[PDB]
Amino acid sequence: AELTPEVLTVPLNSEGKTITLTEKQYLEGKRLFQYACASCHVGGITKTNPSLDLRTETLALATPPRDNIEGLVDYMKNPTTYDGEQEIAEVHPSLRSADIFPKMRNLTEKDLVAIAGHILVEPKILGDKWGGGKVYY
Amino acid sequence: TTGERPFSDIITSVRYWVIHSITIPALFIAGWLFVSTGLAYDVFGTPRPDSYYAQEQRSIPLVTDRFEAKQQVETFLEQLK
Amino acid sequence: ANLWERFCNWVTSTDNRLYVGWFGVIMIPTLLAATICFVIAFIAAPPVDIDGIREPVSGSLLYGNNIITGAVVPSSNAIGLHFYPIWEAASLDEWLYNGGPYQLIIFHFLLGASCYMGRQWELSYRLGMRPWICVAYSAPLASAFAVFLIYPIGQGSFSDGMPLGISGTFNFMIVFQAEHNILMHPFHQLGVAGVFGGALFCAMHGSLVTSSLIRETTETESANYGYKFGQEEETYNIVAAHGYFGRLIFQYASFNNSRSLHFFLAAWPVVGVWFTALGISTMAFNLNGFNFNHSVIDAKGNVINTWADIINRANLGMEVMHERNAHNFPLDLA
Amino acid sequence: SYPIFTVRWVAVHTLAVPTIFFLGAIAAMQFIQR
Amino acid sequence: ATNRDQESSGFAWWAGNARLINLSGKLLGAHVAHAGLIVFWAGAMTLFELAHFIPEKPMYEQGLILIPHIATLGWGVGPGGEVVDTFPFFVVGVVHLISSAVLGFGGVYHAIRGPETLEEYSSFFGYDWKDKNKMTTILGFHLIVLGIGALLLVAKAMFFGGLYDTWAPGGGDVRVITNPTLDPRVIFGYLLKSPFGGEGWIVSVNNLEDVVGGHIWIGLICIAGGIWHILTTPFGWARRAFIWSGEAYLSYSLGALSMMGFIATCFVWFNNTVYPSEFYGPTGPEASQAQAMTFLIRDQKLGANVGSAQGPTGLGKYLMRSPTGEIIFGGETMRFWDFRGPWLEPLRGPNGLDLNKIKNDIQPWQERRAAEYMTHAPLGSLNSVGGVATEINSVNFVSPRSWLATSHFVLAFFFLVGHLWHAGRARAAAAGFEKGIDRESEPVLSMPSLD
Amino acid sequence: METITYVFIFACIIALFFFAIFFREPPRIT
Amino acid sequence: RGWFDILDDWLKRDRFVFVGWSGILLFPCAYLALGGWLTGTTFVTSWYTHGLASSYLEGCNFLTVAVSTPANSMGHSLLLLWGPEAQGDFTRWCQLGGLWTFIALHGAFGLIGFMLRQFEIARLVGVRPYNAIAFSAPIAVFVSVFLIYPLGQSSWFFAPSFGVAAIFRFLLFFQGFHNWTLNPFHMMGVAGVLGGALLCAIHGATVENTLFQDGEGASTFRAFNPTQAEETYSMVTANRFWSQIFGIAFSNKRWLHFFMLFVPVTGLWMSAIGVVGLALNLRSYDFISQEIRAAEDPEFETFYTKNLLLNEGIRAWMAPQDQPHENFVFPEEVLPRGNAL
Ligand code: CLA
Ligand code: CLA
Ligand code: CLA
Ligand code: CLA
Ligand code: CLA
Ligand SMILES: CCCCCCCCCCCCCCCC(=O)OC[C@H](COP(=O)(O)OC[C@@H](O)CO)OC(=O)CCCCCCCCCCCCCCC
Ligand SMILES: CC1=C(/C=C/C(C)=C/C=C/C(C)=C/C=C/C=C(C)/C=C/C=C(C)/C=C/C2=C(C)CCCC2(C)C)C(C)(C)CCC1
Ligand SMILES: CC1=C(/C=C/C(C)=C/C=C/C(C)=C/C=C/C=C(C)/C=C/C=C(C)/C=C/C2=C(C)CCCC2(C)C)C(C)(C)CCC1
Ligand SMILES: CC1=C(/C=C/C(C)=C/C=C/C(C)=C/C=C/C=C(C)/C=C/C=C(C)/C=C/C2=C(C)CCCC2(C)C)C(C)(C)CCC1
Ligand code: OEX
Ligand SMILES: [Cl-]
Ligand SMILES: [Cl-]
Ligand SMILES: [Fe+2]
Structure with missing residues (x-):
């Protein structure tokens, strides 16, 4: 098995468009995910709230849809609850609250796409291990 | 005291290092090339990093028969196409 | 001589059957108190709520235990590191419910064993001996300090200390594996190398001296009578034993110096136990063993399991089952 | 003088020759990427 | 020489x-x-x-x-x-x-x-x-x-x-x-x-x-x-x-x-x-007290009355009493009730943790410090x-x-x-x-x- | 009978400690 | 004097490395078991037998490399190179686990040759063969664990795999499935090993601290001559020291050094007998009187009942991956788990 372009193909938005990431984009997204997210989102779960995971089936059912590159980048700029009612930027890392989350300061638009790409590519590789927890270790 | 030449006489003599200045590094190169050429894989059947699974497969190619074991392994290795 | 002189002469007297000394002045009352309490608690102590969740664990013999299952249950988890003597409880029925006897035992025991170590130097000083025998005894003593005091300190509760029982000891070993992966710690590996090598070197030194005992007895009497207590002549031939063991491997891997040989007999097992005591002590602050989980990955990104990931499956089994009712939150942090 | 080839000579080279061969092979494995 | x-x-x-x-x-x-x-x-x-x-x-x-x-x-x-x-x-x-x-x-x-x-x-x-x-x-x-x-x-x-x-x-x-x-x-x-x-x-x-x-x-x-x-x-x-x-x-x-x-x-x-x-x-006791604090904030946002919630053992799932009576966090962290930290003292009263201050005086900076220290144990x-x-x-x-x-x-x-x-x-x-x-x-x- | 047996065997070991120490055969510089 | 007596003179020559008649069986067998483990832990995999990487080539370190056991489908086969399974192929022989039987069998004959070497050298020197007799405990352990145990089980698959992390798996397996800690024979083995390390430390430290002054230097190691006829340490002073500190003490040199021979050898022999019983799943797993009480009383709890819950958790979590031939599929709702965790 290899990391083929058909594996590195992810939905761009909720209208059907796609974008094929490069291998360096995935490795960059993996490094940055460990830099800013892996403390709470190791393996695809959420230590501070195991009720919400990073599985694509969960991101597609959130409001607004988060199962694409556009939805993930918007979440990293203005994060909301699962139903989009409240804005939780004050207690979740984002560019809007980079003052209190210093690890979100030196992030660029290109970086957020790489982090968004890794969240959408990893479940296609690990299967149930991504977002499964200790049960699938 | 058994008659052999003491070790400190050998490893400190010039002629020992005249011989072992190339015999030690050449064997180091031989083992190096045994892996860099890829021969180490083909001799022992060790799977390559891209030869553990098929592209869309996630199941281990476990041998389930004693006498037909040589047949299943070749059948598993053929499916990597 | 006055009162104090003749009392000091008797305490430090070398003619006593069991030497007392000043270190023994503290060792005798402390070890007797911990021993009397342990025997009474091992037989008739009521169940103790060790994990502080109002779920007592029966430990004594009169409450349905045998020699293998009986134990003196540690103090409650609600007590933590708080000093819990008898006079701090409202009644003995409360003192027995929250694991009172455990603290009384392990405190008087660690005090007496420390005085036991200093007592080993004291007799060696009055007899004109070299005093480093107690240094070797510091290895089993530091091991007791690690599982009784140092680990509870690092975890914040005496309920996590090793219980005082046979089956209780096994529980302490399994929980330590899931929470620290002690088997993958190089210090416990050094400790195993100390006890495995010690048993090897004990059998090796014993089988070589006995294999070279000079003939002094016949065939109808034990060979032990060939040695008389206090004789000047050595009872075996070290050169003959060196001649054999020097050929089993090669000449220079064998010792010809009895002093250097017996120093190796004392160094290897003690240095090994010194590290495994530091292993439990360092892992008391959660510096655990090697973690190679999900370390081998194929070209695509799949996890290629190893024997390290299989050990993680066994640890997860011990992890999710230990103290099944004492956890309300997803992470077990202590 | 001393002999050059002995049983001890054979015993050493039965271990010394493959050890450096393996050290060269294992050293090359440190640069293999996936 | x-x-x-x-x-x-x-x-x-x-x-x-x-x-x-x-x-x-x-x-x-x-x-x-x-x-x-x-x-x-x-x-x-x-x-x-x-x-x-x-x-x-x-x-x-x-x-x-x-x-x-x-x-x-x-x-x-x-x-x-x-x-x-x-x-x-x-x-x-x-x-x-x-x-x-x-x-x-x-x-x-x-x-x-x-x-x-x-x-x-x-x-x-x-x-x-x-x-x-x-x-x-x-x-x-x-x-x-x-x-x-x-x-x-x-x-x-x-x-x-x-x-x-x-x-x-x-x-x-x-x-x-x-x-x-x-x-x-x-x-x-x-x-x-x-x-x-x-x-x-x-x-x-x-x-x-x-x-x-x-x-x-x-x-x-x-x-x-x-x-x-x-x-x-x-x-x-x-x-x-x-x-x-x-x-x-x-x-x-x-x-x-x-x-x-x-x-x-x-x-x-x-x-x-x-x-x-x-x-x-965060110290050993510090991060352990942060996990109980983090999920107390989480479940209370969902409407859980943490003051009346009863755990599986009979003790409080979120809050209980120390052996001397002080209101402390529940779970295994009962051993760590002696912890004192600047991010937790505002919620502490004369008898320990105050339930009224828990319901209404929790600030977002106290929530961020609780989640950061929990994941950095x-x-x-x-x-x-x-x-x-x-x-x-x-x-x-x-x-x-x-x-x-x-x-x-x-x-x-x-x-x-x-x-x-x-x-x-x-x-x-x-x-x-x-x-x-x-x-x-x-x-x-x-x-x-x-x- | 279990508790009585364990305590009986245990008491015999403690009594054996007493006789092995104070009533040992005295070692003599022969 | 014929060819046999000529060859006997050359085998028993006094050289740097003694050969002897036992060397014809020892040296080649001991060399292949060592080289077989080194060759396997560097190049040979375990992906088709266990689904694991087990060599430096695949990405493992010194702690995780191993020569894994053959697959469970192979049974108790000898897995000879020319046999019906490998069919003379060397690569397929490695992929099926032929190295494990290659190491276990050649290593078994090596331990036979090493003990024969102990007998042969002791006779030529003119000493008693007690080191050979004491070496029967290591042989008894290797035979009962690497041979007798799997031959009583289903196949070679459940035998120890020649690896560091693989042996640690073997320890945790016997805990959850056999409850090997509760077996009294392993207890007698633990007392023999820990008691042996006690005798080893307490004897060497006593000798070094009861030495006589035979020199004037601070480093007392040069104050000894191998040819001397006097004891180098005071047996009398050491006797009085341990009698006043501990109560009892050794008074005989010959009984003391035989005592160092008996304790570690007896321990390993007793632990070997218990492992033989584990080959037939004859475990000291349960106390019946404890289970009858706990089944009728939900308030009766001991450390015995708490360790079984850990054993039931060990089996459920590792069996799917540790026994892939069984094809275990355990959903999330059947896995025994405590609260929260
Ligand atoms: C660097 C530290 C240091 C050291 C090594 C010394 C060394 C010495 N001092 Mg000095 N001293 C120091 C600092 C130091 N001093 C300082 C800073 C002061 C100012 C207060 C003094 C004041 C001082 C006086 C006034 C005297 C000494 C004396 C002595 C000598 C004998 C000490 C003795 O027998 O103690 C043995 C100690 C005891 C017998 C006391 C018993 C132990 C008690 C119970 C303390 C409790 C220990 C406990 C475990 C600790 C827990 C913590 C807490 C409970 C306190 C010795 C040369 C004496 C001497 O002869 O000098 C001329 C003397 O009379 N010292
Ligand atoms: C007080 C001592 C101390 C402490 C607490 C630390 C702590 C740390 N150092 Mg530092 N370091 C120290 C001394 C110390 N160091 C010294 C003396 C040096 C000079 C060589 C360094 C050089 C150094 C470098 C260059 C780096 C660190 C880094 C680190 C971090 C990671 C350490 C690690 O991965 O260890 C790994 C664990 C081990 C290697 C295990 C060591 C076990 C020892 C050898 C056992 C010794 C036993 C005993 C003492 C020997 C005697 C036995 C005898 C009695 C029988 C950590 C914060 C790294 C970091 O984070 O940088 C930002 C880093 O890059 N350290
Ligand atoms: C903390 C480390 C340390 C220090 C400071 C010393 C210091 C000393 N040792 Mg010791 N030693 C040590 C560790 C140390 N030792 C250890 C670990 C061992 C065990 C192997 C020994 C074993 C040992 C023995 C066996 C002996 C000493 C002796 C000595 C003394 C004389 C050395 C001498 O004449 O060498 C002469 C060596 C040289 C002239 C070679 C050059 C050495 C220089 C100093 C190197 C400087 C390098 C440096 C980068 C340059 C800096 C330049 C500057 C402008 C910045 C000296 C006081 C001797 C003694 O007691 O004398 C009576 C002695 O016999 N040492
Ligand atoms: C532990 C510290 C220490 C001690 C006790 C000594 C002691 C000695 N040295 Mg040495 N020396 C030291 C450190 C030390 N030195 C260092 C660090 C250096 C490198 C700069 C030298 C370089 C040195 C040389 C090159 C020579 C000596 C000589 C001497 C002898 C006479 C010194 C004299 O006349 O001073 C008298 C006092 C003064 C000249 C005034 C000094 C005032 C100081 C510098 C001001 C600062 C004080 C303040 C506390 C510093 C704080 C430092 C900080 C780390 C806390 C004497 C045996 C001589 C000798 O042995 O002759 C044969 C000699 O030739 N020393
Ligand atoms: C001390 C020497 C020694 C010993 C005891 C062993 C023992 C063993 N080896 Mg090993 N081996 C050795 C040296 C040794 N080896 C050396 C030096 C090499 C490298 C060349 C090997 C390479 C090797 C491989 C590659 C393999 C073994 C295997 C084996 C096992 C099966 C052997 C067998 O069935 O032979 C059967 C043959 C005999 C016992 C010979 C009997 C001879 C008598 C006199 C009969 C003579 C017949 C007569 C001449 C007529 C000929 C036939 C005619 C009718 C056509 C066994 C544990 C196998 C194994 O363990 O598989 C897991 C395996 O695959 N060996
Ligand atoms: C291996 C563990 C070593 C622990 C050391 C403990 C013993 C030390 C006690 C002191 C005694 C006196 C000082 C001696 C210490 C000593 O003298 O050490 C040095 C030792 C002596 O060498 P020589 O005598 O050649 O040295 C020249 C001297 O004569 C100069 O004085 O060197 C060797 O023996 C090197 C061994 C090479 C071995 C290579 C392999 C050879 C094949 C071996 C195959 C064996 C398998 C056997 C089958 C089972
Ligand atoms: C018994 C004996 C002995 C011994 C002795 C000793 C060894 C002693 C010790 C002693 C000691 C060991 C003492 C100590 C003391 C100390 C002190 C007195 C200190 C003080 C401190 C302080 C004052 C502190 C303070 C502070 C700070 C600084 C900061 C933070 C806070 C605080 C407040 C804590 C001898 C040998 C003589 C012999 C006889 C008998
Ligand atoms: C006696 C003795 C000994 C010892 C020795 C020692 C211990 C010494 C010391 C020494 C030392 C301890 C030294 C040090 C030095 C240092 C130096 C010389 C420094 C310099 C520096 C510099 C030059 C810097 C530069 C810079 C700057 C200024 C800025 C930043 C950057 C840089 C870093 C570049 C021994 C063991 C051998 C033995 C014999 C005897
Ligand atoms: C199997 C087989 C065989 C055999 C082979 C052989 C015999 C081989 C050998 C091989 C070898 C013989 C190899 C070797 C190797 C070695 C090595 C690879 C080593 C390494 C080492 C090291 C690495 C070291 C380290 C260390 C230590 C240990 C301690 C401290 C220091 C140090 C760190 C340095 C034959 C062909 C017959 C047949 C078929 C099969
Ligand atoms: O207490 Mn006795 O064991 Ca040390 O982790 Mn947490 O807490 Mn409990 O769980 Mn796991
Ligand atoms: Cl448990
Ligand atoms: Cl909890
Ligand atoms: Fe001895």
């Missing part, structure tokens, strides 16, 4: 430093050179920590131990412990490193080129181990240097910027201490506290006023004690009690440094005042993998509290073995039978039988 082989000295090469017991000139070059190695590492490690320093990441995520020691002293940090100027860290690293070459020069000189024995050169610097009057003078001189250093910390806190106070109102900040605690009932009250849970001996100090006021007392006592031993000779009861030899004096310091080694290990593992969590990470592997022992490889983190506590405990134990080794031999060497038993004068052979 004076006393440099086994025949002329009596010591093999593995005990070759013992050939310096009666060589004052060479021995001085050994202590000055070793002191150079100490300052060399203090300067080189700081420059190594500065070159690898990322300001936007917390110090405990980067494996720093020396920069947090400098950041605690109020140099280079601002409100909340955020780094605002990394140049003071550079100055401390350079000046310590530069000073190592000066100590190294004198160490190499006094050890191979200078006089082998200072008894010839100067009567002021030459000494004898059995000279009870001269030994106390060197003890008093170094006592005064220690008392000055203890007052140098006080001057930094009172006249030169102050210290970093994690308990400062409105958040942690650099603050100058103006009123140090001089009351001996409070200062010496720490020494008489129990070392067990709920008390903690001197580790439980939780304000800089008790810290600075203590270093004033320590500075004055060392000065008064230093002048004492310089002018006085040991009394008779002390002469008949101690062994007066060079090896015995080293054994005393080994037992003293081993005792101090255990104290620092518990200091960094429990105290968050002189080791602020903003620099060293001092748990990790030897190869620096953060999490529990079953966590998968992802996070590169081991708390500096775990690096400092485990290291100084291994050092504290081996230095206790050094005490038992050198103090036992000092007794045997002064008595005259450290080399073995006299075959013609065996002491046991002159004793009656045990039975």
